[PDB]
Amino acid sequence: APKAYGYVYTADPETLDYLISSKNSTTVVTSNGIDGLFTNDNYGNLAPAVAEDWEVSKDGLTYTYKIRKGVKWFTSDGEEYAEVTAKDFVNGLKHAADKKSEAMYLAENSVKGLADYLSGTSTDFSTVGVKAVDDYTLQYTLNQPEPFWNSKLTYSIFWPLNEEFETSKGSDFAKPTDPTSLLYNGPFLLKGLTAKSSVEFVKNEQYWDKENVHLDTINLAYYDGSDQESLERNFTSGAYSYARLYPTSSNYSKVAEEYKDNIYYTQSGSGIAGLGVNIDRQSYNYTSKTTDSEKVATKKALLNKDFRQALNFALDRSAYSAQINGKDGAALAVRNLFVKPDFVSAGEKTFGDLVAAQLPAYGDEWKGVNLADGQDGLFNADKAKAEFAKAKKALEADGVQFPIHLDVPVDQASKNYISRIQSFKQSVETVLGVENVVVDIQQMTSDEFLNITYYAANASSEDWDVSGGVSWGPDYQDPSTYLDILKTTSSETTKTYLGFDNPNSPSVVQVGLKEYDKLVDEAARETSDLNVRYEKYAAAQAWLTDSSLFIPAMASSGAAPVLSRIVPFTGASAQTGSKGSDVYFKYLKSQDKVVTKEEYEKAREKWLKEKAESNEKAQKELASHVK
């Protein structure tokens, strides 16, 4: 049946608590069942969801939302539980504060009074700027104007939660194998969760917007990457509605000929994939190093910027991308900046344009840098060797003995993650020399890998020197969503990408990240002039690019060959947040036959023309909400 959506998921969630988690694995299992104030339509506009109307004050500090009447919470079995009301959003944000949400960075400095409730300086949540004025009138008060505030409302920390239900479940609330431990107000009900097996939804047949829901069921099968041919195999059997293809699969020639008229390439996504550098490694349960001298050498090397730049310039991103995309389409996915270069624009200049204007202050090697997607602007063997020569002399003068050994962990179930890291290893070793740098690939189980990367509890658990196991996707429409998370104080995310969680660590001072904090904070204070705000965030990105503390490699999604039975451009389109069609399947339509590449390309050109129209119409309509 076309109305039975089938695909895959890649990691069991640690929790169903969408208010507390910053991990996509929670979004994957909850977005289809939980709506907030807005969703995204198929052109990327904010669409009314639980908010039927909204207004903002002239000074931009007070947002008021009329809650749609008659929207119900339902159990996983379709039992009506309660009305959705403004109080559920008050409770949602209170729970996020009380239980110390991993995503608090995007609310703590925006909602008035929240930072003081978070720390305990204020004891009553009534002093926080979220108010149920009445059952269907929800009001937020902010510390400063935020043109991107409404875009935050498609992210999960701003979803509602019924307090009666939360309290009644107690310690059983939001348990990751128990769909009865949440309630659902969205287009689907979460019906099943089986570890390392399946995630299951059914259509919410009492949903207020069920007219825009065109799937009866959703089934996601667990996929750990050990059998990458299973995606196309299950598509062709009719089990899956979609299949991402891997041109390095041994049977790919047969698939390519079979589906010659159907394989098409998606646009690069907004999230960043690359390699984080652990600047403060604590644990060595996964290492090839055998002496303390080797461990000190690696620790000093990673604090040396020239050493990090040598790795950055040595990485052949086309070869890396080709381990999942094949040589022909590899360039499409390459990315040279943490922030997607066209994520925002200031007039005619992209964010990448602004970064490129400022980067050459750090060094002539950045002059003429091409930061655009779709080409490798950073790979340069000559510059990599030059930077390592500078690092070698500084490190030898400090008694460091070479080669520098770098532990990089891999999930031994994901064949093409191993292949990507093997390509990183060959890049660094061929350009800099194994006499100088050795990349020691640490193979481990899926669960062992999760517990030192994606689900690492703390910086001590980041048992690696360099890792590409975790990407970052933007949560709302402002460069802060990328750049704030690497500030010395954003300990939830600094452990994941940089290996530290102590904001005052000596390693953190040594690499100069307190300077990065000041650039980020100076950009954040610009609320008057968006062009100036973006120029200032580009100064922070410029510092980050030069620091090479994160090595960008490719877009974390998209830029891939795919097969589809989904009617092109019927799904939600979202650059940020938790309501895009990667996790949220309202609006999406399915069809009998496999989409042809010509059908997709024609729909895309027509969609691009309608999207520019619809987006401009939406922007012109914003003034009508200033009250």
Binding site: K23, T27, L231, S446, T453, W472, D475, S557
Partner: peptide
């Protein structure tokens, strides 16, 4: 949002 890169299914 943090996402795992070991499998790139989209």
């Amino acid at each position: 949002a943090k996402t795992i890169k070991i499998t790139q299914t989209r």
